[PDB]
């Protein structure tokens with residue numbers, strides 16, 4: 001019962017891959033220790049293949065089937081619609097990988113007849129054939145990290161035509177079902193501000209709160225055929241159009257449960273029997289499956305008043321404490337239950353008695369103070385990976401601008417405000433590209449965003465306090481400072497100095513540029529302006545934003 005079988009054909013690249021940090025005239029203004037930053041390449045895919053390849057065994061008990069019955073009871077209340085071809089086509093990213101069959105993402109988005117004709121033929125075939133495995137391309141991801149080296153992650157995805165049909169059958173399902181089935185535990189529903197609020201209120205809801213993060217070793221590889229059938233049975237509880245049901249069963253049999261792996265050069269690389277990383281249902285399936293198993297394991301471990309927070313394969317549980325020694329015992333029982341369900345941990349879970357000491361999705365809760373002095377809670381992280389990618393993006397144009405994503409999702413943080421906003425607005429001012437829309441990612445979904453609209457977006461995801469936070473905590477300041485020394489990034493005082501320059505330059509352009517200077521950089525100056533609610537922030541249609549996650553899902557807004 002192996003996650004993968006392999007032929008020995010290599011996972012080949014699509015193009016030239018750089019492993020070393022590109023340097024330009026801007027590089028040393030951000031980061032001087034360039035040998036610390038690297039990009040993963042297909043060269044390391046061979047190592048990743050070994051890591052992700054193992055036997056899965058599953059022992060399913062009454063807690064499991066009990067939780068699944070409840071999950072299905074809530075699933076049965078969901079009505080989901082089929083998307084039209086044209087609705088699905090406009091959800092396709094502009095630089096989504098082109099079809100093998102003679103069209104690309106822009107053909108799809110323009111509703112070109114060749115594209116649409118092929119998509120109708122793929123759909124007709126899904127309705128007619130519920131057995132034939134669907135081909136997938138396997139590729140190494142190119143992502144940037146700091147040293148102390150990870151191997152390349154693997155992306156497995158079907159043809160463009162198939163991807164549009166997934167949207168047609170399942171987009172409304174994966175968008176509406178997870179909140180209904182999991183309620184407040186479904187993490188992708190929250191803005192970062194709503195998410196902190198939920199965590200703190202949940203932490204406060206307990207008499208003696210304890211919490212842990214539970215992170216599964218190679219989650220996609222732990223997902224069995226049973227797990228993918230159980231997900232399908234949940235989707236099928238929904239009130240669906242008959243073609244949707246058939247297409248969902250076809251996509252499950254032929255794509256989701258498994259299939260042949262082909263490289264970029266067309267060679268058969270092997271065969272998948274676990275989760276594909278680049279299908280529509282990756283995030284939702286993972287979130288459901290992770291919730292099912294973890295809720296069941298809570299019951300096996302008799303944890304009092306478990307609150308789950310689940311996003312994909314990331315899981316935090318906050319529950320009632322039984323004292324440190326017994327909590328420790330209980331976590332091992334939790335871990336014992338999860339492992340039996342084929343979800344063992346990378347690192348064993350540790351109980352925590354301070355909300356700020358729990359880390360999941362690389363992030364933790366911390367505290368600062370707003371204008372009035374009142375404490376505000378916010379999500380932050382070690383800035384190392386964000387900064388290493390900022391350094392890469394200073395010298396190379398990338399299809400996803402992590403700096404922009406990081407400004408949006410960590411806008412209230414010290415390091416995003418002082419370093420990322422300062423640095424990238426300076427570059428944008430110099431190139432006169434403040435109004436140029438840039439592709440970025442929030443919860444795995446693709447967004448095209450104009451840097452000038454950041455103040456609006458930040459106010460909506462965080463509120464006006466994002467522009468007013470101060471008196472950050474000694475622990476947080478310490479981590480950032482230490483990261484800046486390790487990477488060879490100038491100290492925070494240099495950034496305050498440059499921010500005043502950036503601020504004045506932005507004000508000197510007037511308009512939306514001036515708004516950016518006023519709101520984003522008010523922290524930089526001594527005589528603080530008063531920051532009132534932004535007129536335009538109310539106008540912005542933030543629907544699609546924070547209903548669900550779509551990591552690997554090939555979704556654009």
Ligand SMILES: CNC(=O)c1c(-c2ccc(F)cc2)oc2cc(N(CCO)S(C)(=O)=O)c(C3CC3)cc12
Pocket residue numbers: 187188191192195199309310311314315316355358359360361362363364365379380409410443
């Ligand atoms: C189950 N885990 C969670 O819900 C998350 C926690 C977390 C929870 C409890 C805790 F004690 C410490 C941290 O922090 C997060 C940050 C992000 N973001 C970053 C995505 O990498 S963000 C800052 O955009 O909100 C996300 C995004 C993926 C939805 C999810 C979580």
